[PDB]
């Protein structure tokens, strides 16, 4: 149920017109930027995660 | 949940582990806290299980400690018990 609805929502493909071309600096900074601003319904961003 | 797979890994067939841990816990409540590896938390059952996880207890070793305990009961009295036996002929 909900859990799925959650995960599917956080990992859905998007046009990413807003959150485009983002260097993550790692999963942590990526999360910081995600919580902050300019990231909504996921984004087309490269992740530095080891 | 605490490292249960490792605990079972230390003693095959799961069930047998349950019986053993039970016996050890009965040891904890029967005589003294004693034992080893020593976190002192979460009661007798989990103290026994954590003990088994670190292979501190073990079935054979427990059986060995029991035989040594039988030797300890032999210790003391002994000559007095045999005195109680010799008086009765």
């Amino acid at each position: 149920q909900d859990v799925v609805l959650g995960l599917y929502y956080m990992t859905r493909d998007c046009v990413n017109a807003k959150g485009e071309g983002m260097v993550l600096t790692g999963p942590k900074e990526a999360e910081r930027l995600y919580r902050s601003g300019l990231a909504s319904l996921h984004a087309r961003v490269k992740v530095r995660i080891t | 949940r605490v490292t249960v797979q490792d605990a079972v890994e230390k003693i095959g067939n799961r069930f047998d582990l349950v019986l053993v841990a039970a016996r050890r816990a009965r040891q904890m409540q029967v005589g003294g806290k004693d034992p080893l590896v020593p976190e002192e938390n979460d009661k007798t059952t989990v103290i026994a299980l954590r003990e088994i996880e670190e292979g501190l207890i073990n079935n054979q070793i427990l059986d060995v400690r029991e035989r040594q305990e039988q030797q300890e009961q032999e210790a003391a009295e002994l000559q007095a018990v045999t005195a109680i036996a010799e008086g009765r002929r």
Binding site: Q1, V3 | R1, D42, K43, T45, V46
Partner: protein, 101 residues
């Protein structure tokens, strides 16, 4: 009792109402109150606990520490119809169940 969702619970946990726990673990609680100096005798412990006298609760927390309860729902079609959980004391009359189970 009636069951309600318990999102904050760990998989090995369950929500157990305070009153229910108090009733279920009664002899254990008397025993513990006799071992520690909280009551002179089993009868005294009962008389005290019935009143719901304070510190009986904390004692109950000491009683269910590391202890497990079995939860069961009819119909029991497979062996997972009964499972063991570590009980967490909760306000309210409802049993709180983990969503994964």
């Amino acid at each position: 009792s009636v069951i309600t969702v318990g999102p904050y619970l760990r998989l090995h946990q369950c929500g157990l109402p305070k009153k229910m726990a108090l009733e279920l673990f009664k002899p254990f609680i008397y025993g513990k109150l006799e071992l520690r100096g909280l009551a002179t005798t089993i009868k005294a412990a009962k008389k005290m606990v019935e009143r719901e006298e304070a510190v009986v609760w904390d004692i109950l927390d000491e009683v269910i520490r590391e202890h497990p309860v079995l939860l069961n729902r009819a119909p029991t079609l497979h062996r997972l119809g009964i499972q063991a959980f570590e009980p967490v004391l909760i306000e309210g009359k409802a049993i709180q169940l983990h969503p994964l189970v």
